[PDB]
Every structure is written in C-alpha cells, then in structure tokens.
C-alpha cells in the first residue's frame, strides 16, 4: 500500500463529514481565500478610483458606510481589462488604490463555483446516483460568470463589472437599463417568466403536497412529526392532490407521472435563468433590446408617443447622469 | 482646427481631455477611451512612435483619409438593437444597421455556452452509463446504506 494510494483514497472517501474529492482540491483553497479577502475588504478597504478620473469612492465599513451602502468597488477604469495581481503593483497601498481586491475576489469566486459544480458531480458519482444536479446548478454559475466576467470582457473594462454590494448592485442594474434597455430584451422577459413561474410552481406544489397528508398525528403535535426518516411508503396521497388539481383547472390539464412533474419543476427556472444569462452575454457585445422609439406617426408625420417613448425618456434621464465626470465626447462608445 | 493647443487642455477632472498617459507611461487618447489604449489599427499606427502617440505627427502630419476613416467608424459603431434600430438605445430609429461583429460574437457565444452545457450533460450521462446506474439506484444494493453513518 503506497502513500499516493492511501491519499487518493482519503480524498475520494464518502465517510468524511464534508466530501473533499478532487474538485475540492480546487474549490476549498480558492473559495477560502476569496471569502477571507472579501471579509477583510468589506471592513477596511481604503477608497478606490473606479472611473480612473482620480475620484476615489469609499466602500468600506470603517469609512462611513453601512451594510447596504458598503461594497467592494471594482477595479479602476485605467487598468481596463489588464491583469492586476498583487505582485504587479509597486506597493500594497497602490494595489488598494486601483481596486485589485475586486479582481482577486472575483477570479477566485468564479474558479470556486466551477469547482463546486465539479464537486457536486463527483459526489453524485461516488454515491451511485444520476449525475445531473450540477447541470441545474450551471444556471446560477452562468449568470454569475456573465455578470462578473463576460460583461467586463465585452465592454472592455473590469470597472463595468457588478460591484460586490447592495447599492452597487442597484447602480449596476440602473446603468445597464440606461445603456442597454434590458427590460425590452426578450431574454430578460424569459427570465422574469422563469422566476415567476418557479415561485408559482414551488408554492403550488408545496400546497398540494402538504394539503394531502395522511393523518398520522394528533392535533397537539406538529404535522411534520407524522413522517419518519427512512420511510417505505408515501406520506402523501397523490390521488387526492391530482383530483383537486384537475377539478381546479381542467381534467386533461394535469400531471400524473410525478416524475414528469418534478422534471418540469427542474426544467422551468433552469431554462429561464440560462436564457437570461444569454441575454446579459449577448448585450455585453451591444445587441440591445427592442427600440420602438417614434414608431407611431400620424398622417402628417408628427410623432405620437407610446409607452416605449416614456421608457426612452427615463433611460435618457439615467444616461445623462451616470458617471457625470467620466465623459468628454457626445457618444458613449 | 479651431486653434486649441491639443495636449495642453486640462479635462474637467484635470486629467487631460485629448492626450493622457497610460499606466505604462505611453501617450494615449484621453477620456473614457483610456481603457482601450491597447488598440492598434492601420489608420492610427502612422501616428504612433516608440513613445506612444507622437505629438509632432499629430500637430503637423495629419491626413484627410484618416479623418474620413475615423468619421466613418465613429458613425458606424458596433451598437444596435434586436430589431436593428442602430445607434444608442435612446436614439430614434432612422438608421438601420447592426455591425456583423456584434451578430457573430453574440450568436457564437450563445452556441459555445450551450455546447459547454451539452458537454456537462453528456459527460455525466456517459460516465453514469459506463458505471451502470444511469437508470436508478437499485433498491436492494443502495450504496448509501452500506456506508458508515455520520
């Protein structure tokens, strides 16, 4: 029995409190350093110039911020897309002045979530189950990559990525609306439909299952105590739930193969989020949503406003104000 | 052309609105386009020296064809909409143009990610089928019940 073997075995063991696996060798150190740097920076990071115009923005708790206003400000616009690790700066203070911690945290977080997907698959393989949970987890990973990496790549600067904070997230969303018209993009519509449908189906499935629960408890005891871990029979009556659902809407319209029902539950939000991440990715290369500006014209030629023109008005209001000092020329290219 | 001394006019932030210095020291165009200082185009290289954008060439040896090329490129930027309105999202729809670069990049990025998803799905299924539990668990040889508790 060699040493390598022994190791490989401990690593791929399924009796450890938390599964390590080979993807864990990438997930654990990377996520740990990302979270350590994030926690330190959220508390004591000095101001950073993000627009590269020598106007630093404070985002740390010790610099007069609260939980909502605080954020990890993305790297400077002067750097752009350039790689900026610690050792390329002449001093740590300068590294902090140009927003290096944002790059560090975001790159490590992306590697960590990819390794997290891999580790999910690896444990699925070890336990002898069907290996497609990480496919479902791919959708949030794709969304995070689009918002943190793909959009800066398309725009050409890391300063365009989503800042790690609440108010920073809202600022990113508003500027995205102004410069890109996300709402009128069919992929954002698909994503909103997917999220609303996911909530709808979650609530309805939970209500239908809990409503039809076999009576195996008193009244002075939590209904949840009727079920025992490791049961052999279904604690709920599918027949009653399907009868209620069919009578509610229609007989034909109803799922019976609970397997098909759960597959649909998995399918709806996942495809919605995939389509949304594709909206963000496509719009990172300036393929914006529909522009129905001045589409309606009367006989003479005068323009009649629609509801889209008021959206354009709000977009103009946001646009002429964002990054007030950064621009020097009429067009935002 | 108006006679303003280029490379001496401080910008609104005091940084310089026409000529700046790159973080490596090279002389580049100012404004928000300082993020794109890595650019190398055939119509702008004639003006570049070893130190960056040469100033004596800009002040004296400028060419009309460069002006025409720059105007045409500014007037045709890779900006557009799904219905191909063209221009900025807030612009009215009179022009009809979306750059083929945008089409190619967006379409192929979409296809590339969905083929990555295909890789994930098929790799998982292929390995599960080779192992022999791509249809279920077993219900009589469930591996979870044979492992130590935790």
């Amino acid at each position: 029995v060699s040493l390598w073997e022994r190791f490989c075995a401990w690593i791929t063991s399924t009796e450890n409190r938390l599964y390590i696996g080979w993807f864990g060798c990438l997930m654990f150190p990377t996520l740990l350093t990302a979270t350590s740097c994030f926690i330190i920076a959220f508390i004591a990071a000095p101001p950073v110039d993000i627009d590269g115009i020598r106007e630093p923005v404070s985002g740390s708790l010790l610099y007069g911020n609260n939980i909502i206003s605080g954020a990890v400000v993305p790297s400077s616009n002067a750097i752009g897309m350039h790689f900026y690790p610690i050792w390329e700066a002449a001093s740590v203070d300068e590294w902090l002045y140009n927003g290096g911690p944002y790059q560090l945290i975001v790159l490590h977080f992306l590697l960590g979530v990819s390794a997290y997907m891999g580790r999910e698959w690896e444990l699925s393989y070890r336990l002898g189950m069907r290996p497609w949970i990480f496919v479902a987890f791919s959708a949030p990973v794709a969304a995070a990559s689009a918002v943190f990496l793909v959009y800066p790549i398309g725009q050409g600067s890391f300063s365009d990525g989503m800042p790690l904070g609440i108010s920073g997230t809202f600022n990113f969303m508003l500027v995205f609306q102004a410069e890109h018209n996300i709402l009128m993009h069919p992929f954002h519509m698909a994503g909103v439909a997917g999220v609303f449908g996911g909530s709808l189906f979650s609530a309805m499935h939970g209500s239908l299952v809990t409503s039809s629960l076999i009576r195996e408890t008193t009244e002075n005891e939590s209904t949840n105590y009727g079920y025992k871990f490791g049961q052999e029979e279904e604690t709920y009556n599918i027949v009653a739930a399907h009868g209620y659902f069919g009578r509610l809407i229609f007989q034909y319209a109803s799922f019976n193969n609970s397997r098909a029902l759960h597959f649909f539950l998995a399918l709806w939000p996942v495809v919605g989020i995939w389509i949304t991440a594709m909206g963000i990715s496509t719009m990172a290369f300036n393929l914006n949503g529909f522009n129905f500006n001045q589409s309606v014209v009367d006989s003479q030629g005068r323009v009649i406003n629609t509801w889209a023109d008021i959206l354009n008005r709000a977009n103009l209001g946001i646009e002429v104000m964002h990054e007030r000092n950064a621009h020097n020329f009429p067009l935002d290219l | 052309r108006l006679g303003a001394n280029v490379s001496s006019a401080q910008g609104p932030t005091g940084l310089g609105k026409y000529l700046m210095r790159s973080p490596s020291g090279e002389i580049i165009f100012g404004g928000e386009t300082m993020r794109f200082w890595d650019l190398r185009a055939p119509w702008v290289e004639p003006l570049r020296g070893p130190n960056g954008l040469d100033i004596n060439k800009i002040k004296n040896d400028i060419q009309p064809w460069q002006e025409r090329r720059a105007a045409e490129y500014m007037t045709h930027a890779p900006l557009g909409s799904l219905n191909s309105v063209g221009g900025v999202a807030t612009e009215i729809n009179s022009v009809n143009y979306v750059s083929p670069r945008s089409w190619l990049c967006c379409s192929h990025f979409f296809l590339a990610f969905f083929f990555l998803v295909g890789h994930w799905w098929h790799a998982g299924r292929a390995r599960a089928a080779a192992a022999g539990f791509e249809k279920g668990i077993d219900r009589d040889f469930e591996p979870v019940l044979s492992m130590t508790p935790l």
Partner: peptide, 29 residues
C-alpha cells in the same frame, strides 16, 4: 462607532451558520 455593531452582527450570523453545520441534529433512520 456603528461599524462595531455591523461587524458584530455579521460575525454573529456567521457563528450561527457555523453551529448549524457542525452541531446539527443527526438524522437517523
């Protein structure tokens, strides 16, 4: 001075998360 309160709240939440993973009720069959 409120930075102290914010830090305390965040660290307390993290500690609660820590106790819910390594000090959980073991589910038995």
């Amino acid at each position: 001075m409120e930075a102290l309160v914010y830090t305390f709240l965040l660290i307390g939440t993290l500690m609660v998360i820590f106790f819910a993973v390594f000090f959980r009720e073991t589910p038995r069959i």
